[PDB]
UniProtKB/Swiss-Prot annotation:
Protein name: SH2B adapter protein 2
Location in the cell: Cytoplasm; Cell membrane
Function as written in the Swiss-Prot or TrEMBL entry: Adapter protein for several members of the tyrosine kinase receptor family. Involved in multiple signaling pathways. May be involved in coupling from immunoreceptor to Ras signaling. Acts as a negative regulator of cytokine signaling in collaboration with CBL. Binds to EPOR and suppresses EPO-induced STAT5 activation, possibly through a masking effect on STAT5 docking sites in EPOR. Suppresses PDGF-induced mitogenesis. May induce cytoskeletal reorganization via interaction with VAV3.
Self-association and partners: Homodimer. Interacts with KIT/c-KIT, SHC1, EPOR, PDGFR, VAV1 and VAV3. Interacts (via N-terminal region) with SHC1. Interacts (via the phosphorylated C-terminus) with GRB2. Interacts (via its SH2 domain) with EPOR, INSR and KIT. Interacts with GRB2 after B-cell antigen receptor stimulation. Interacts (via PH domain) with VAV3. Interacts with NTRK1, NTRK2 and NTRK3 (phosphorylated); after stimulation of the receptor by its extracellular ligand and subsequent autophosphorylation of the receptor. Binds INSR, GRB2, ASB6 and CAP. Insulin stimulation leads to dissociation of CAP.
Gene: Sh2b2
Signal peptide from the UniProt entry: none
Post-translational modification: Tyrosine phosphorylated by JAK2, KIT and other kinases activated by B-cell receptor in response to stimulation with cytokines, IL3, IL5, PDGF, IGF1, IGF2, CSF2/GM-CSF and cross-linking of the B-cell receptor complex.
Organism: Mus musculus (Mouse)
Family per record: Belongs to the SH2B adapter family.
Annotated disulfide bonds: none
All residue ranges annotated as the PH domain in the record: 17-130
Distribution of this protein across tissues and organs: Strongly expressed in brain; also expressed in spleen, kidney and skeletal muscle, and at low levels in small intestine and bone marrow. Strongly expressed in B-cell lines, but not T-cell lines. Also expressed in myeloid and fibroblast cell lines.
Amino acid sequence: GSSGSSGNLAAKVELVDIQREGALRFMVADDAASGPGGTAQWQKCRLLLRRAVAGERFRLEFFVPPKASRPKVSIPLSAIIEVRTTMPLEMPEKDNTFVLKVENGAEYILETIDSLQKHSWVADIQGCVDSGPSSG
């Protein structure tokens, strides 16, 4: 007698749940024609990468502002289907920027301190999205 079919996943890992956390700017590729336009769409937010519970492996949180008690654009790590590290023609191809393609056809352009932080992040996310098991 049992229910769930999850399995026995026990790891004595001696590491921290939070993979990576930092305060960087984020933006979504869209019309954004909500006015005249000008100021750098770049918005202040805090990126917090932590493992999720109740199934979900991980979940990305975009605290906007980064001082808010709760995340504004809290997206699950499951939504991410592909992370493009390329840049458009209107972008100077910053060394500290990356795109996040979710399952809802939405790209989130983020900008970290330097090419050092950026790359890292791409690893914290990709390392989770992929790591996740095939089923359940």
